[PDB]
Design an enzyme around this catalytic site. Structure first.
Site, mmCIF file in Angstrom:
data_model
loop_
_atom_site.group_PDB
_atom_site.id
_atom_site.type_symbol
_atom_site.label_atom_id
_atom_site.label_comp_id
_atom_site.label_asym_id
_atom_site.label_seq_id
_atom_site.Cartn_x
_atom_site.Cartn_y
_atom_site.Cartn_z
ATOM 1 N N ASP A 57 -3.707 -7.274 -5.212
ATOM 2 C CA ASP A 57 -4.591 -7.231 -4.054
ATOM 3 C C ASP A 57 -3.890 -7.891 -2.867
ATOM 4 O OD1 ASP A 57 -6.421 -7.624 -2.068
ATOM 5 O OD2 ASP A 57 -8.007 -8.429 -3.355
ATOM 6 N N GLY A 74 1.195 3.329 -2.264
ATOM 7 C CA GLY A 74 0.663 4.330 -3.172
ATOM 8 C C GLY A 74 1.463 4.530 -4.445
ATOM 9 N N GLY A 119 0.852 -1.168 0.000
ATOM 10 C CA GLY A 119 0.000 0.000 0.000
ATOM 11 C C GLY A 119 0.889 1.220 0.000
ATOM 12 N N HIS A 176 -3.893 -0.211 10.444
ATOM 13 C CA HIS A 176 -4.760 0.646 11.235
ATOM 14 C C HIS A 176 -6.201 0.699 10.706
ATOM 15 C CE1 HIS A 176 -6.828 4.528 11.278
ATOM 16 N NE2 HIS A 176 -6.643 4.445 12.584
ATOM 17 N N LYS A 209 3.164 0.122 6.648
ATOM 18 C CA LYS A 209 3.119 1.425 7.304
ATOM 19 C C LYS A 209 1.734 2.041 7.206
ATOM 20 C CE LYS A 209 5.176 6.082 7.010
ATOM 21 N NZ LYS A 209 3.909 6.734 6.579
HETATM 22 N N1 LIG Z 1 -6.215 -4.904 -1.564
HETATM 23 C C1 LIG Z 1 -5.227 -3.994 -1.541
HETATM 24 N N2 LIG Z 1 -3.925 -4.323 -1.879
HETATM 25 C C2 LIG Z 1 -2.895 -3.426 -1.866
HETATM 26 N N3 LIG Z 1 -3.047 -2.099 -1.512
HETATM 27 C C3 LIG Z 1 -4.336 -1.772 -1.178
HETATM 28 C C4 LIG Z 1 -5.421 -2.618 -1.168
HETATM 29 N N4 LIG Z 1 -6.587 -1.921 -0.766
HETATM 30 C C5 LIG Z 1 -6.178 -0.717 -0.551
HETATM 31 N N5 LIG Z 1 -4.826 -0.510 -0.770
HETATM 32 C C6 LIG Z 1 -4.037 0.551 -0.659
HETATM 33 O O1 LIG Z 1 -3.989 0.867 0.742
HETATM 34 C C7 LIG Z 1 -3.241 2.037 0.890
HETATM 35 C C8 LIG Z 1 -3.675 2.489 2.347
HETATM 36 S S1 LIG Z 1 -2.815 3.919 2.748
HETATM 37 C C9 LIG Z 1 -1.221 3.108 3.167
HETATM 38 C C10 LIG Z 1 -0.316 4.150 3.739
HETATM 39 C C11 LIG Z 1 1.077 4.224 3.242
HETATM 40 N N6 LIG Z 1 1.927 2.959 3.311
HETATM 41 C C12 LIG Z 1 1.845 5.368 4.015
HETATM 42 O O2 LIG Z 1 2.941 5.124 4.544
HETATM 43 O O3 LIG Z 1 1.259 6.509 4.047
HETATM 44 C C13 LIG Z 1 -3.700 2.901 -0.261
HETATM 45 O O4 LIG Z 1 -2.594 3.433 -0.986
HETATM 46 C C14 LIG Z 1 -4.595 1.911 -1.087
HETATM 47 O O5 LIG Z 1 -4.542 2.174 -2.477
#
Ligand SMILES: Nc1ncnc2c1ncn2[C@@H]1O[C@H](CSCC[C@H](N)C(=O)O)[C@@H](O)[C@H]1O
Ligand SMILES: Nc1ncnc2c1ncn2[C@@H]1O[C@H](CSCC[C@H](N)C(=O)O)[C@@H](O)[C@H]1O
Ligand SMILES: OCc1ccc2c(c1)OC[C@]1(O)c3cc4c(cc3O[C@H]21)OCO4
Ligand SMILES: OCc1ccc2c(c1)OC[C@]1(O)c3cc4c(cc3O[C@H]21)OCO4
Lengths: 354, 354
Positions: A240, A199, A197, A258, A254
């Site tokens: 996913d 981004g 995740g 939460h 990170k």
């Molecule tokens: N099934 C999935 N697999 C991978 N990423 C996913 C997901 N569902 C949501 N996300 C991703 O989850 C992230 C949550 S925000 C994660 C925060 C980031 N690591 C930081 O340090 O700020 C988003 O970027 C969203 O696109």
């Protein structure tokens, strides 16, 4: 006795808010900047002059200073005396805590202070009673304003508020760099890392600023990672996380667990243990999120953590996990051990081992 | 290191206000009353049921409870379990601090808590910056609302606010009785006492409730004492404390020196030393007012005192004295020694000896 001694404890909590407002005033006045720019202990007069205060506001400045000094944000010093030979006079110096208020520096937390103590964060408490006794499930902010925090900020009328809040988030992400500098041993023996995740790669870019040779892969949803590329030690992969996570020496989580309940978080942790499986007992998973340790001897740290947790509750209806909750997930996921390292005042970096 | 350890201290103060809002919620919810009326440790469920909370508000109740327990307002206990044989379940008990929140009792401080943490006391901080940088000398409340606190309360629109504030004052005067019960040795060997600025005899009536045989004389301005009479151990005398004070074994100065500058306070103290002169080294003067001891080892008590002092500043532009300031007056007045006894959480009772 009479346990009329209980009054002292009752009142400390009643008036605790005064200390927060005092810090708030210190930052908005730019005191830290004034003294820092001065280059040496500053006198009340000199400081009042720097802030260009009206003569009548000087004693108020004095009052706030006394409380702030007693609270550790300043240190008193006695200096020579107003030229045209010496009288004795008090001079104020910054302390580690207030150096965090010096603008322009990478360590500045002024924005987070400003936002956390902004009217949009405080005024809502006047609806605390109505909030408890109503039948609608909502945040204290929605109950008080009639709209979610997110909507409020996006209103043309709140251009600046949305800007300030926005500054605090950037400042908070930036701090994570310091987190990396202060904990290199966490990433030292790693050849690869998968940022779940991640981004568009913002966090990984920071990691790449401290560990340029670490091969990192930013993992996120197909539509967010689009088709980004390059940087031989940087690649993007869409997918996913509930199905699988790209394999690497370590998995970074990170601020992800939460947002998910235990059932979803457990599945994510399990997929994380698989992504490092090939590396055996060498791999690790890195969880960066809050961990509240009620049994900790540092009662004040736990209070602060619980305080933040209460802000998450009244503003977003969100929650933070305790050390036990975290332990359940970790062991339930199949890991063997783990270690928690406190970071950024009250947050936590958790190293999880298979 | 890096003094990135300073963050922890910075944040504790930023989020300190959360603990005040939590106490505020506890009192407005009437939790103390609920548990007290229950007569024994109460379960989350039972408590939620007593407060008649909507099902969705139960977990919020839980959250506030955890923070409040960690802060010492409740004690966790594990009890049998929901009937239809036992599961393990948590039960909450009152602690000395929260027993102060039980309504109907003489020790209830709920009103002072409600007023101190009322929107009319808190919302004004959003103008703290404008207040520091303006050229008008006024309170933070005037700068924020456009009218003095006194005027605000008297507005038809603020009927209830003026009522609540009014309740806190009555509750505060009433506490002074406990002060007397807890410090009889202060008035034991006295045959007579002169209550300076005793208005119409409210305070002396309390003294008469604990020390019925003490001959007290309520001293105030001719127009306030009118021509009140009686009660062989109670007499009224009109006059000007700056000219002279009726003679007696001891002079009581309860909340008087607070309103006067040093020059006026010194004159009052000097007249006080004269009123007891005939009694020689036996007489004493009793000052009831705040005394801030910066050098005290109880740093938290000093912070609370300084916090209250800051409320007096932003609301009324008033001030409280430190132990040194008090010492200067006392010795400057010609007294030999003095003793300070902490009272009502953070106030002080000062026995002054010629
Ligand atoms: N099934 C999935 N697999 C991978 N990423 C996913 C997901 N569902 C949501 N996300 C991703 O989850 C992230 C949550 S925000 C994660 C925060 C980031 N690591 C930081 O340090 O700020 C988003 O970027 C969203 O696109
Ligand atoms: N010159 C003077 N001599 C005596 N009393 C005076 C005075 N000037 C003002 N006062 C009285 O000062 C009092 C201040 S309020 C005193 C508070 C009171 N002892 C209590 O315990 O609440 C008023 O009652 C006022 O009438
Ligand atoms: O974990 C992410 C994160 C990090 C910091 C903060 C968060 C969330 O929200 C609560 C907070 O206290 C807050 C509330 C605000 C604000 C800024 C602000 O910063 C603080 O501007 C307006 O209201
Ligand atoms: O020494 C006398 C005295 C005693 C207690 C209090 C005083 C003054 O003012 C400040 C205070 O915090 C306060 C402010 C308020 C209020 C009540 C209230 O009680 C607190 O209602 C509205 O605003």
């Amino acid at each position: 006795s009479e346990l009329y001694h209980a009054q002292i404890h009752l009142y400390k909590h009643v008036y605790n808010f005064v200390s927060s407002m005092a810090l708030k005033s210190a930052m908005e006045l730019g005191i830290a900047d004034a003294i820092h720019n001065h280059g040496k202990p500053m006198t009340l007069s000199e400081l009042a002059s720097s802030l260009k205060l009206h003569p009548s506001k000087v004693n108020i400045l004095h009052r706030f200073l006394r409380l702030l000094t007693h609270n550790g944000f300043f240190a008193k010093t006695i200096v020579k005396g107003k030229e045209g030979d010496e009288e004795e006079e008090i001079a104020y110096s910054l302390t580690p805590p207030s150096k965090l208020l010096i603008s322009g520096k990478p360590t500045c937390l002024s924005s987070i202070v400003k936002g956390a103590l902004h009217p949009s964060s405080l005024d809502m408490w006047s609806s605390s009673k109505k909030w408890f006794n109503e039948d609608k499930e909502q945040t204290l902010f929605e109950c008080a304003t009639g709209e979610s925090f997110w909507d409020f900020l996006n209103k043309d009328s709140e251009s600046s508020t949305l800007s300030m809040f926005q500054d605090a988030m950037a400042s908070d992400s930036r701090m994570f760099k310091l987190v990396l500098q202060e904990n290199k041993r966490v990433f030292e023996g790693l050849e690869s890392l998968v940022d779940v995740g991640g981004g568009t790669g913002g966090v990984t870019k920071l990691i790449h600023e401290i560990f340029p040779h670490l091969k990192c892969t930013v993992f996120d949803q197909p539509q967010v990672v689009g088709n980004l590329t390059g940087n031989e030690n940087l690649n993007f992969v869409g997918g996913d996380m509930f199905k699988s996570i790209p394999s690497a020496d370590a998995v970074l989580l990170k601020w992800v667990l939460h947002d998910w309940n235990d059932e979803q978080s457990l599945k994510i942790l399990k997929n994380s243990k698989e992504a490092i499986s090939h590396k055996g007992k060498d791999g690790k998973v890195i969880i960066i999120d809050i961990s509240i340790d009620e049994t900790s001897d540092d009662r004040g740290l736990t209070e602060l953590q619980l305080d933040y947790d209460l802000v998450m509750l009244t503003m977003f209806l969100g929650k933070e996990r305790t050390k036990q909750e975290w332990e359940k997930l970790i062991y339930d996921a199949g890991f063997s051990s783990y270690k928690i390292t406190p970071i950024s005042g009250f947050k936590s970096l958790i190293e999880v081992y298979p």
